Design a protein around this ligand. Structure first.
Ligand SMILES: NC(=O)C1=CN([C@@H]2O[C@H](COP(=O)(O)OP(=O)(O)OC[C@H]3O[C@@H](n4cnc5c(N)ncnc54)[C@H](O)[C@@H]3O)[C@@H](O)[C@H]2O)C=CC1
Ligand SMILES: NC(=O)C1=CN([C@@H]2O[C@H](COP(=O)(O)OP(=O)(O)OC[C@H]3O[C@@H](n4cnc5c(N)ncnc54)[C@H](O)[C@@H]3O)[C@@H](O)[C@H]2O)C=CC1
Ligand SMILES: NC(=O)C1=CN([C@@H]2O[C@H](COP(=O)(O)OP(=O)(O)OC[C@H]3O[C@@H](n4cnc5c(N)ncnc54)[C@H](O)[C@@H]3O)[C@@H](O)[C@H]2O)C=CC1
Ligand SMILES: NC(=O)C1=CN([C@@H]2O[C@H](COP(=O)(O)OP(=O)(O)OC[C@H]3O[C@@H](n4cnc5c(N)ncnc54)[C@H](O)[C@@H]3O)[C@@H](O)[C@H]2O)C=CC1
Lengths: 268, 268, 268, 268
């Protein structure tokens, strides 16, 4: 019971318990939402991970690059939530960019095939998911994707930043479509969260200079953030996602909410 | 009970029952907040107006241009809410620009004395209010001001748009100060709301061409808005203000939330 | 002689005499630049078109999706301009999005393969071109790409707008690379220009509703533009491109100059 | 002779030889412009300073807060340039904020009277100057003001940043007016320039912490700037101002050109 009581919400993007989407799922359940989860490749893993969620939630396979998965998606969700029931919320918390598109690999050296896959999973799939799910969403519904502010270039994030810029653009178009359904579409631009991958890149997985730069990035983020930024705490971002899934931001779409400690509003 | 249960929130800016702040007050009370109101010049009027709020709320005079009012403000609020109690939220819903700074009066013809008064009440007072009230705000608190997106120029709004640009700048600095207190500071950029004044300007009070332009503005807003925009309904904006007053946007400050139907994210 | 006197500048993107790049080429030559042109598929056509340029300019084939073309590009340019000579400027005036990614074809119905090709040619190729050409660019050099402001969604332009958002992101990264060479990288966001394709879409080639919307778009652009916008005149944009190719914007990179009549700075 | 040959251009804001406007004046003269200068309080000083300009230029007193100065301004300029001659360019390079509005003085402690004076001189005067001078400007003319990117808050700059936000807003409205005259209005957002005042604040004139912060600000600016930023060199900014005064940015108004080394396009 609470912020999302009675809402049926699909949450994609759980892969581990430090997945941003894990915390989104957890908070949404604490707030009364009934979840359907989608998981990409390692469903056994994901099932075991989501066992620790406050409540049980059906898990559906969704490889966002798999047209059949997307084509079957709404029927599978309807099976999961019961005929005559629709989704009130959809959470896109998916992103990927091949290593060549990031870190120390020179920006110019990322082969387009890699970039394109990154943009497919990280940006285009936002529209894919909305296409699959809008038919089974209620008026007053909410689609939320995860963004990392790409409005300025930065070290290491390279083509993933490009992918986020594309995602932000996609979101504005998804909002136009979603609006026909009485549905809002918005992004949450989060501060840096020490996910496994972020920890790995800080630890030098994508090159020492990239690691050093990302560390400087996270330090400066907390410094700039008027209320600070705790990269080890995804809860403030999960809460923000939940804010958008709720009825409490009913006049916002095609938009980006910055759950980044206010870092983006401050130069130094 | 609900979104704001237990929160003590000061709401400025009620002058009539069509004041944006009236609806902010109403929704906040429906959501469990305990209010203190401030009212500017016509306290008898404002008291009679706020009698229709779901709950009684002490009303304090606050002329934001009156240094003594601001100097006494926190003690008066403490009297009203009880010693040992602090505010959790502050709503700045105040704005004013002399007629010369708006409408058909040529932009170049607004005397600086008029502009300055407009900027005093509409922008600087955001910092004034934060200065007066941050000492009596709890950690986790929230200050929210009302904004109208000034990022592009527009007909008729003239120097009030300039004042909003200044307000947005002020908010970013107020966030820096507020952050020391564990307090967030944010603006809600609302779509156009058919307040008495907006109705009056549509009806030609500031010149026929200004009226015509503002009418075109509100029509285009609803057209652009992916979810539409109902200028006769301040509830979606009151709800958004409440979202920011709540614990559900805990990593956003110095920021602007657009409760405008998504109009600003769409060109045409 | 003039603004670009002595500069050696590669201009991509001429396909017809109404190509934005044709006018960029023409103005650059009027201003003293020595050009190398690249042309994509119809070289005989392009040669015949560029015969009308004020001066002769070597034409090199460049299919931006062809890795060999890009791999050979700098040597071919060096052959064309003479060993020991480098480029001072590069103009990316290339864009393409399959029909499915635009117009009346539902946004959700653009297959990723189409989108990806669009993003390849329209966004990624900006980095491709910079990768190929930075080794043969002089310090103080300038790379300029053509942008159409994607900061808000719009009818009909659909995935091309997404591609522009990606391009703007790419440009910011290209600037980081280009900076190592003493080279600036910038976009020109032009107003709508009645190119063959734009005329075709206005005339209904991508659906009547798309045509109607684009017509409304161009009308509103001129209305919003404080100095007007003449979609039949690419000269103000060619001049702006030339401004960026010149030494007169020497502290601007990763940036976007808006040659749009000021339309983007105005709401209504 | 050159970029501005034959143009008659009013350049305000020279106070010393390290004034940004001194370099704007110098470059404009090197480029063929005929100047009229305006100077604020110390005309003897300013005359002696501008004696070192490449060419002689009439100097007119203009206190932008003095309505009579502004009321007489266009006739005095016409006297200076000759009846039947008009201005082609106007440079607003004026700014001021009382000490209370900056540095270590708490943001909340700047009395509105101080802020208002700051906003008067730094923002409103942009409109004042355009009002005074548009009647005596040629079609194809250009008004340029000096901006410091206020889109994010920063240490020390406090209410001057607010003033710049207001200036940027004013510029968008001035463009609407200027457009009626065939005149463009634009800002140049410069990187930090080690003007006397900036040197003084770095040296602790407005508090040690403000000095330290501004020093960090200038260091980070050069680091972020893809082409670097040399705060001791106003020439790249003078050149940019000249770019806008020229015919080479003929489709840009109400706009801001960033002569900041690209720093604003980069996060880290
Ligand atoms: N960690 C951070 O600092 C920030 C992350 N974000 C965004 O949050 C979102 C979630 O990522 P995180 O939780 O950080 O990492 P994560 O690695 O835990 O989540 C990424 C998810 O994307 C899924 N995915 C990858 N390819 C897929 C495909 N083909 N089909 C379906 N799912 C696929 C993965 O299985 C995984 O669940 C991403 O969009 C990310 O860019 C935004 C701001 C900051
Ligand atoms: N009506 C609209 O379309 C939009 C309004 N807003 C903003 O919402 C806020 C509230 O305005 P509305 O509700 O529309 O109009 P309103 O006229 O009902 O509220 C303005 C309030 O400001 C108060 N005020 C004026 N001078 C004051 C002073 N010296 N000291 C203390 N209070 C003073 C008035 O008493 C009144 O309560 C304003 O900031 C306005 O700019 C934002 C977007 C759109
Ligand atoms: N026409 C307009 O209203 C606006 C156009 N722009 C941009 O200006 C640029 C030039 O386009 P326009 O002159 O309008 O149209 P255009 O059709 O004359 O130019 C597009 C060019 O891209 C080239 N191209 C396509 N695929 C290519 C590939 N594989 N390799 C190399 N070149 C390829 C074409 O051959 C053609 O020369 C584009 O980036 C466009 O998006 C920007 C704002 C407005
Ligand atoms: N120095 C810097 O790092 C940056 C400065 N700018 C802007 O460049 C512009 C010029 O300032 P700077 O050259 O840096 O300093 P400056 O101190 O040399 O120029 C300021 C000018 O404003 C004039 N002024 C002050 N009050 C006036 C009034 N009542 N009437 C007429 N003129 C008045 C002063 O006499 C002086 O000539 C200002 O708008 C400033 O904010 C923009 C970005 C950075």
């Amino acid at each position: 019971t609470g912020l999302l009581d009675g809402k049926r919400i699909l949450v994609s993007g759980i892969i581990t318990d430090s997945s941003v989407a894990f915390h989104i799922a957890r908070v949404a359940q604490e707030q009364g939402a009934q979840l359907v989860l989608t998981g990409f490749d390692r469903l056994r893993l994901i099932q075991r991970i989501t066992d620790r969620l406050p409540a049980k939630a059906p898990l559906l396979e969704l490889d966002v690059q798999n047209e059949e998965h997307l084509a079957s998606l709404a029927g599978r969700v309807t099976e999961a939530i019961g005929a005559g029931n629709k989704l009130d919320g959809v959470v896109h918390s998916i992103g990927f960019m091949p290593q060549t598109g990031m870190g120390i690999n020179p920006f110019f050296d990322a082969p387009y095939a890699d970039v394109s896959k990154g943009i497919h999973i990280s940006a285009y799939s936002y529209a894919s998911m909305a296409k699959a799910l809008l038919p089974i969403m209620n008026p007053g519904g909410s689609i939320v994707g995860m963004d990392f502010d790409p409005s300025r270039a930065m070290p290491a994030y390279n083509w993933m930043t490009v992918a986020k810029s594309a995602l932000e653009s996609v979101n504005r178009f998804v909002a136009r479509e979603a609006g026909k359904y009485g549905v809002r579409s918005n992004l949450v631009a989060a501060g840096p969260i020490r996910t496994l991958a972020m920890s790995a890149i800080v630890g030098g997985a994508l090159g020492e200079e990239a690691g050093a730069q990302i560390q400087l990035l996270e330090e400066g983020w907390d410094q700039r953030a008027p209320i600070g930024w705790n990269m080890k705490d995804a809860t403030p971002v999960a809460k923000t996602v939940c804010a958008l899934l709720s009825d409490w931001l009913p006049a916002t779409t095609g938009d980006i909410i910055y759950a980044d400690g206010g870092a983006h509003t401050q130069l130094l």
